[PDB]
Amino acid sequence: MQRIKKGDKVVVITGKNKGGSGIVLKIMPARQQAIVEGLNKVTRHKKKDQTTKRAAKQSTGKVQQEAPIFLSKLALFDQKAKQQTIGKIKYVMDPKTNKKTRVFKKSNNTL
Amino acid sequence: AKKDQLTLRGPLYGNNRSHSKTITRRKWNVNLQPCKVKTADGKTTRILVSTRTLRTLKKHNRLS
RNA sequence: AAAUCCAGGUACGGGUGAAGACACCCGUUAGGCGCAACGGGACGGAAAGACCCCGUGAAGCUUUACUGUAGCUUAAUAUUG
RNA sequence: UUGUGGUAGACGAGCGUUGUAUUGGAGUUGAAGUCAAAGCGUGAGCAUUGGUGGAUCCAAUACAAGUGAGAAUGCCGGCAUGAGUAACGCUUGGGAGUGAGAAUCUCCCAAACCGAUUGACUAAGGUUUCCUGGACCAGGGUCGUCCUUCCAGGGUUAGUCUGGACCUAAGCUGAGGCUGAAAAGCGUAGGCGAUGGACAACAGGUUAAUAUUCCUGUACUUACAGUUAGACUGAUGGAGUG
RNA sequence: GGGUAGGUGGUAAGAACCUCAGAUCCGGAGAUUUCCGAAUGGAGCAAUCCGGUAGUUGGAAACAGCUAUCAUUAAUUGAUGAAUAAAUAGUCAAUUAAAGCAAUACGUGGUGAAGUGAAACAUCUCAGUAGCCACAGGAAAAGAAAACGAAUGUGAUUCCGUGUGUAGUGGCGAGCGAAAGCGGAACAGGCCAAACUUAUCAUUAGAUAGGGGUUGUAGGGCUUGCAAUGUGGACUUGAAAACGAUAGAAGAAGCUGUUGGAAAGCAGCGCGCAAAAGGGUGAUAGCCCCGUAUUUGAAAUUGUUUUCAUACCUAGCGAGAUCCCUGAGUAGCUCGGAAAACGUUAUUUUGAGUGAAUCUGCCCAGACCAUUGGGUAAGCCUAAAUACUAAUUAGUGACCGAUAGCGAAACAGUACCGUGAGGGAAAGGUGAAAAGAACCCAGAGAUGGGAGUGAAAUAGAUUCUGAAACCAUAUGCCUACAACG
Ligand SMILES: [Mg+2]
Ligand SMILES: [Mg+2]
Ligand SMILES: [Mg+2]
Ligand SMILES: [Mg+2]
Ligand SMILES: [Mg+2]
Ligand SMILES: [Mg+2]
Ligand SMILES: [Mg+2]
Ligand SMILES: [Mg+2]
Ligand SMILES: [Mg+2]
Ligand SMILES: [Mg+2]
Ligand SMILES: [Mg+2]
Ligand SMILES: [Mg+2]
Ligand SMILES: [Mg+2]
Ligand SMILES: [Mg+2]
Ligand SMILES: [Mg+2]
Ligand SMILES: [Mg+2]
Ligand SMILES: [Mg+2]
Ligand SMILES: [Mg+2]
Ligand SMILES: [Mg+2]
Ligand SMILES: [Mg+2]
Ligand SMILES: [Mg+2]
Ligand SMILES: [Mg+2]
Ligand SMILES: [Mg+2]
Ligand SMILES: [Mg+2]
Ligand SMILES: [Mg+2]
Ligand SMILES: [Mg+2]
Ligand SMILES: [Mg+2]
Ligand SMILES: [Mg+2]
Ligand SMILES: [Mg+2]
Ligand SMILES: [Mg+2]
Ligand SMILES: [Mg+2]
Ligand SMILES: [Mg+2]
Ligand SMILES: [Mg+2]
Ligand SMILES: [Mg+2]
Ligand SMILES: [Mg+2]
Ligand SMILES: [Mg+2]
Ligand SMILES: [Mg+2]
Ligand SMILES: [Mg+2]
Ligand SMILES: [Mg+2]
Ligand SMILES: [Mg+2]
Ligand SMILES: [Mg+2]
Ligand SMILES: [Mg+2]
Ligand SMILES: [Mg+2]
Ligand SMILES: [Mg+2]
Ligand SMILES: [Mg+2]
Ligand SMILES: [Mg+2]
Ligand SMILES: [Mg+2]
Ligand SMILES: [Mg+2]
Ligand SMILES: [Mg+2]
Ligand SMILES: [Mg+2]
């Protein structure tokens, strides 16, 4: 399975942004990146191009979007625990459904 | 080729040594001669064989 | 663009010198820098002289040079009575 | 105390480069590289500081070498000199327009050369160089708004034209076969091979680009089937013509 | 089968979809596989043209779709059949194999130079090398003594060290150079012909198919007995098991502060280890991530080994007879060559000629003869050690780091040169992240100057660092009567 999936809450443990909590919107496995909403906001200088029916307007000024972040800098966020903390996960297989599930190693919380 | 039809023995390549031991490549050819070999009273083909094979056939009562 | 180019700020007369000097010795002359000309010199440029000699170098050709050989011709022997 | 010029040459002692092995040390508070400066050595050489640079490097003792560049009409790359010099490879003037910019682009009027040709149709070859619009990185021996250059789109219509589905010349290939150490060479029957022989379409119009091909008009030729009438049909071979 | 939550190959954003009834992706097994090319229906200027035959569907037929087949040679079989009665040659049909390529590498065989050295050159060397051709194989070749050789000797072949640069061989010059023995790697010996016998061929067999036999301190056959039912193979089919190969699963351990754009650096306090190999993460991370040590797992294909059964082969010691068999144009010999270290010679081989004997036999022990001794030619097959790497997996380097390393880090045998064979380059690095510079000014525009992002824009796509030659600008000094390495 994968350490980080599309949807789970995640934070950053290195860089200028420390303790930045967000939801992963998209994962590129090949480039080992991850788009997390609200984090790594870059503002491309949006030019103007008019060669299509939609390009006739293409209103784009200082649109701030999301820049991808290396998957190593991401860490899963705990929610079930009363005191939330950042830890590592296991890949135990519970015989109830025989499906692999991530479980933290500093607690006993699933996913 | 200049070779027997019963056997496959062909030419022998060697040196032509003379006085002063000068080397020149030469070829010995087999004594190919025409002969007719009967086989069960028929097919008297005019094969081209060497004299050695001809002698062998003669001493074998023309058997091949 | 081009061949050329060791670095140059690159006079003339007599002598000297590897034996014919822009550069050495002794004298004379000459403000700095161009442009248009013509070829005296720079033993000017292009071509590791084709002439000559050397190399126990190459190649082509010639002959009663040597050693061989294709081909031609003669004999023995086998096919062959 | 005696000495210390020196080529060929002999001998001895050292410097420097890269890497490896053992130790220690420096480095985003800035390593290597790289530039500058008014330093230290007997020599190869070695430091200090500052600028640039952005991640490796230094000292000691040993070991192993693709280990030291000024010359080889040395190889490669760059840049000078000659020199803004020679040259720019047969063809004029003006008016109007476009354009930011015009001797060079567009139109018009002349003018000058070709006119058994610089005119027109095609074979061979070339392979999109053809038409339209746009552009002026590069190419055009100048310029350029322009080009046979570049970009985007488009363009080649056949029963009768040129060649196959027809035929052979020189020649090539060539089952068998002959010859030859091997590879192969020769060669019969067959099969290819036009620059030749046989075979039915002419006139006009149309698009920016095709036209005996598309369109209009009028024709022709060869196959197959049905049908009518007449006739016995007569080749893979013989003969004539070709 | 594994494995998930993403995917629709790169220059590549966007548009439109697919995907949790399990996608994309990885592995095993299959399906489809246009045309040229051994090309093989015929041709031909390669990727084109022109067909025949037998089916089937439309048409009224020509015709047009959709299928299969159609080359040559060799072997076997059958049919037909000339000169010429029979019979062959030939013709036709059916079945089975062969064609070709590459691994710039190893093997065998045929053919086979020259540059060069000898300080010239012809013998010789180079060298049986290069090249040309034929045939393979996973290796090939060789191979079980008519042997070495001088002894109370060894007992197939192959490869390594020594013997030794020795004995020798050489215009005795340049040079060339073993065979014994010894020490090692591996080790394996089998099977036909003839005798004798069985059955069948107009049985003129001298031929076909079986039993018997495979030799040297001679063996086998002929006749007559004892002992044998085993051990082992280079061996066929099966069944079972084990070890692997082709995807994978799990896989421990860290926070705080400081410089900094950014920490992983530095410092403090800790923790894990059968994991301190490596890669990435904004600098230099054992504890951030992927991994590594270790434990594991295969539906399907495939490799090695072992066990059981099962085919095939595989068996000793005597006696008598005194009879038979033991590889012929063969061994020798002569005339020309060659192989061996030998420049031809005892041994090996052959183009021409000639030509033996049959265990009281034949060959050999460097001419040759005698004694002694060794061995059984003229028939075949043979694993292992040995030679090499185009390719697949893992890994290493006191090997290279864009003039180096393969010619080729990039789309290189490309661009380009030549009719052709053939010859043959150069060229890598923005930044952690394109956040690739919106906007304003000048300009026709590219572009430049600001602004903005960024730690840095003198990192700006001309994109790491940026040396010298070379070209310009400037502070200071000197230079227009001056003969200048
Ligand atoms: Mg010779
Ligand atoms: Mg004098
Ligand atoms: Mg000379
Ligand atoms: Mg001479
Ligand atoms: Mg000579
Ligand atoms: Mg004669
Ligand atoms: Mg001295
Ligand atoms: Mg060092
Ligand atoms: Mg520095
Ligand atoms: Mg060197
Ligand atoms: Mg020059
Ligand atoms: Mg100049
Ligand atoms: Mg001049
Ligand atoms: Mg002039
Ligand atoms: Mg002029
Ligand atoms: Mg002109
Ligand atoms: Mg003019
Ligand atoms: Mg005129
Ligand atoms: Mg004309
Ligand atoms: Mg073109
Ligand atoms: Mg045009
Ligand atoms: Mg235009
Ligand atoms: Mg121009
Ligand atoms: Mg028509
Ligand atoms: Mg024809
Ligand atoms: Mg013609
Ligand atoms: Mg036209
Ligand atoms: Mg599946
Ligand atoms: Mg010679
Ligand atoms: Mg010589
Ligand atoms: Mg010499
Ligand atoms: Mg073999
Ligand atoms: Mg895992
Ligand atoms: Mg882990
Ligand atoms: Mg690390
Ligand atoms: Mg003898
Ligand atoms: Mg020899
Ligand atoms: Mg005997
Ligand atoms: Mg003797
Ligand atoms: Mg014998
Ligand atoms: Mg290179
Ligand atoms: Mg370079
Ligand atoms: Mg070409
Ligand atoms: Mg700027
Ligand atoms: Mg530059
Ligand atoms: Mg730079
Ligand atoms: Mg003065
Ligand atoms: Mg004066
Ligand atoms: Mg003077
Ligand atoms: Mg002076």
Curated annotation (Swiss-Prot), chain A:
Self-association state and partner proteins as the record states: Part of the 50S ribosomal subunit.
Function: One of two assembly initiator proteins, it binds directly to the 5'-end of the 23S rRNA, where it nucleates assembly of the 50S subunit.
Positions of region (Disordered): 43-62
HAMAP family: Ribosomal_uL24_B
Name of the protein this chain belongs to: Large ribosomal subunit protein uL24
UniProt keyword rRNA-binding, yes or no: yes
SUPFAM superfamilies: Translation proteins SH3-like domain
Transmembrane segments: none
Gene3D superfamilies (UniProt xref): 2.30.30.30
Homology family: Belongs to the universal ribosomal protein uL24 family.
Organism from which the protein derives: Mycoplasma pneumoniae (strain ATCC 29342 / M129 / Subtype 1)
Keywords, alphabetical: Ribonucleoprotein, Ribosomal protein, RNA-binding, rRNA-binding
Swiss-Prot record, chain B:
GO MF annotations in UniProt: structural constituent of ribosome
One Pfam family linked to the record: Ribosomal_L28
Ribonucleoprotein listed as a keyword: yes
Region (Disordered), start-end ranges: 1-20
Cellular component terms (Gene Ontology): ribonucleoprotein complex; ribosome
UniProt keyword annotations, A-Z: Ribonucleoprotein, Ribosomal protein
GO BP term, example: translation
Superkingdom in the source lineage: Bacteria
Gene3D superfamilies (UniProt xref): Ribosomal protein L28/L24
UniProt xrefs under PANTHER family: 50S RIBOSOMAL PROTEIN L28, LARGE RIBOSOMAL SUBUNIT PROTEIN BL28A
Family: Belongs to the bacterial ribosomal protein bL28 family.
Protein name: Large ribosomal subunit protein bL28
